[PDB]
Design an enzyme around this catalytic site. Structure first.
Site, short mmCIF file in Angstrom:
data_model
loop_
_atom_site.label_atom_id
_atom_site.label_comp_id
_atom_site.label_asym_id
_atom_site.label_seq_id
_atom_site.Cartn_x
_atom_site.Cartn_y
_atom_site.Cartn_z
N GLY A 1 8.52 7.23 5.91
CA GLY A 1 9.16 7.31 7.25
C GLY A 1 8.58 6.35 8.28
O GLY A 1 9.31 5.73 9.06
N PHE A 2 7.26 6.22 8.25
CA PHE A 2 6.52 5.22 8.99
C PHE A 2 6.77 3.71 8.65
O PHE A 2 6.21 2.80 9.32
CB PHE A 2 5.04 5.53 8.76
N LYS B 1 1.72 -3.65 8.70
CA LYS B 1 2.64 -2.54 8.78
C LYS B 1 3.97 -2.98 9.37
O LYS B 1 4.04 -3.43 10.50
CB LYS B 1 2.01 -1.42 9.62
N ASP C 1 0.04 14.29 14.26
CA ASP C 1 0.29 14.34 12.82
C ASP C 1 -1.04 14.18 12.03
O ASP C 1 -1.16 13.44 11.01
CB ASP C 1 1.33 13.27 12.44
N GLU D 1 -6.97 -2.98 10.81
CA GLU D 1 -8.13 -2.99 9.91
C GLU D 1 -7.77 -2.42 8.56
O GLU D 1 -6.93 -1.52 8.44
CB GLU D 1 -9.24 -2.10 10.40
N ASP E 1 -7.34 7.50 0.77
CA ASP E 1 -6.89 8.43 1.80
C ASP E 1 -7.29 9.81 1.33
O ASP E 1 -7.56 10.02 0.14
CB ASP E 1 -5.40 8.26 2.14
N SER F 1 4.91 3.30 1.46
CA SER F 1 6.05 3.33 2.34
C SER F 1 6.62 4.72 2.47
O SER F 1 6.43 5.58 1.61
CB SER F 1 7.16 2.37 1.89
N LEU G 1 0.81 -1.24 0.00
CA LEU G 1 0.00 0.00 0.00
C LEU G 1 0.83 1.28 0.00
O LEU G 1 0.60 2.15 -0.80
CB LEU G 1 -0.97 0.02 1.15
N1 LIG Z 1 -4.29 5.67 -1.02
C1 LIG Z 1 -3.51 4.51 -0.59
C2 LIG Z 1 -3.26 4.54 0.94
N2 LIG Z 1 -2.11 3.72 1.37
C3 LIG Z 1 -1.44 3.92 2.68
C4 LIG Z 1 -0.30 4.70 2.80
C5 LIG Z 1 0.33 4.90 3.98
C6 LIG Z 1 -0.13 4.32 5.15
N3 LIG Z 1 0.58 4.55 6.42
C7 LIG Z 1 0.38 5.78 7.18
C8 LIG Z 1 0.26 7.07 6.31
N4 LIG Z 1 1.29 8.02 6.66
C9 LIG Z 1 -1.30 3.48 5.13
C10 LIG Z 1 -1.94 3.31 3.87
C11 LIG Z 1 -3.12 2.51 3.79
O1 LIG Z 1 -3.74 2.37 2.59
C12 LIG Z 1 -3.73 1.86 4.96
C13 LIG Z 1 -4.91 1.08 4.83
O2 LIG Z 1 -5.52 0.95 3.62
C14 LIG Z 1 -5.45 0.48 5.95
C15 LIG Z 1 -4.87 0.63 7.15
C16 LIG Z 1 -3.74 1.36 7.28
O3 LIG Z 1 -3.18 1.52 8.51
C17 LIG Z 1 -3.14 2.01 6.19
C18 LIG Z 1 -1.90 2.83 6.34
O4 LIG Z 1 -1.38 2.95 7.60
#
Ligand SMILES: NCCNc1ccc(NCCN)c2c1C(=O)c1c(O)ccc(O)c1C2=O
EC number: 2.7.11.1
Length: 273
Positions: free
Chosen positions: A16-17, A35, A135, A89, A96, A14, A12
């Protein structure tokens, strides 16, 4: 027991997290997100009730994962020799807020009002469980496209809520309040309200208000888009330069612009179907 119990899929994202993948629980096919966080990059540890040495994010997610709300829930976690792995979940289908705003531009007020309200409920919920996210921004909010439900996601710069000053920050600069820029100090609630101000402007203008430190410190808001003689008032209030002049969550939610919010289902009906 990890690579057995879940089935990995596409990455999905990548940054810093860490790295997050799409997953399925084999037990039953719950969509999930997997994650991975590397031990080397965790500046900030905590400890569970039973007293083990974990990344703070896990502490924080555990405190807010009880019951339902607008926070994405920690289903489980694992330790590996060099990384921690979190199972979360995953709504289906999801998008997003950053991509949503990027695709559709500035949001109609009614939709912004609905989104903004749900963020406020989520952040109230967090402040309640003793957690401060730190954040809050478009790319840390997921939209469940069917139910019209927003969910907060990345707790890795988070901290336990407390009433004394904070002198560390890891969120995004452009979202950081002037008192952090000038003094390297802030208090939780009022810094969160500032970032909520940034968020709301974003929603209604398609873009963030401030780019450089001088703009933040000057705190003057120009509207590039048509926006109501109200939404502009709430926004400027949240973005007051003096923390003490910002509204509480209660005052944000009793503001005229926040009246008659739609429910999430009718929000999706009208604006996402
Ligand atoms: N539009 C694609 C969104 N992809 C993510 C990017 C960073 C990201 N990390 C934090 C952003 N800074 C996450 C996700 C998730 O799609 C995601 C998800 O679909 C379901 C649960 C999730 O925790 C994430 C998530 O933590």
């Amino acid at each position: 027991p990890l690579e057995s119990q879940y089935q990995v899929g596409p990455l999905l994202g990548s940054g810093g997290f860490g790295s997050v993948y799409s997953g399925i629980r084999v037990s039953d096919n719950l969509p999930v997100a997997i994650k991975h966080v590397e031990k080397d990059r965790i500046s900030d540890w905590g400890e569970l009730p039973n007293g083990t040495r974990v990344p703070m994010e896990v502490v924080l997610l555990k405190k807010v994962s009880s019951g339902f709300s607008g926070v994405i829930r920690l289903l489980d976690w694992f330790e590996r020799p060099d990384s921690f792995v979190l199972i979360l979940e995953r709504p289906e289908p999801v998008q997003d807020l950053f991509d949503f705003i990027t695709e559709r531009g500035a949001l109609q007020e009614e939709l912004a009002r609905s989104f903004f309200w749900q963020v406020l409920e989520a952040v109230r919920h967090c402040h309640n469980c003793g957690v401060l996210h730190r954040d809050i921004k478009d790319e840390n909010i997921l939209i469940d496209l069917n139910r019209g439900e927003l969910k907060l996601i990345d707790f890795g710069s988070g901290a336990l809520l407390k009433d004394t000053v904070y002198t560390d920050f890891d969120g995004t600069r452009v979202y950081s309040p002037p008192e952090w820029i000038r003094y390297h100090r802030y208090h939780g609630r009022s810094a969160a309200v500032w970032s909520l101000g940034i968020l709301l402007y974003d929603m209604v203008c398609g873009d963030i208000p401030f780019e450089h430190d001088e703009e933040i410190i000057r705190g003057q808001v120009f509207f590039r888009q048509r926006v109501s003689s109200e939404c502009q008032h709430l926004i400027r209030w949240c973005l007051a330069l003096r923390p003490s002049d910002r509204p509480t969550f209660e005052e944000i939610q009793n503001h005229p612009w926040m009246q008659d919010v739609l429910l999430p289902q009718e929000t999706a009906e009208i604006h996402l179907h």
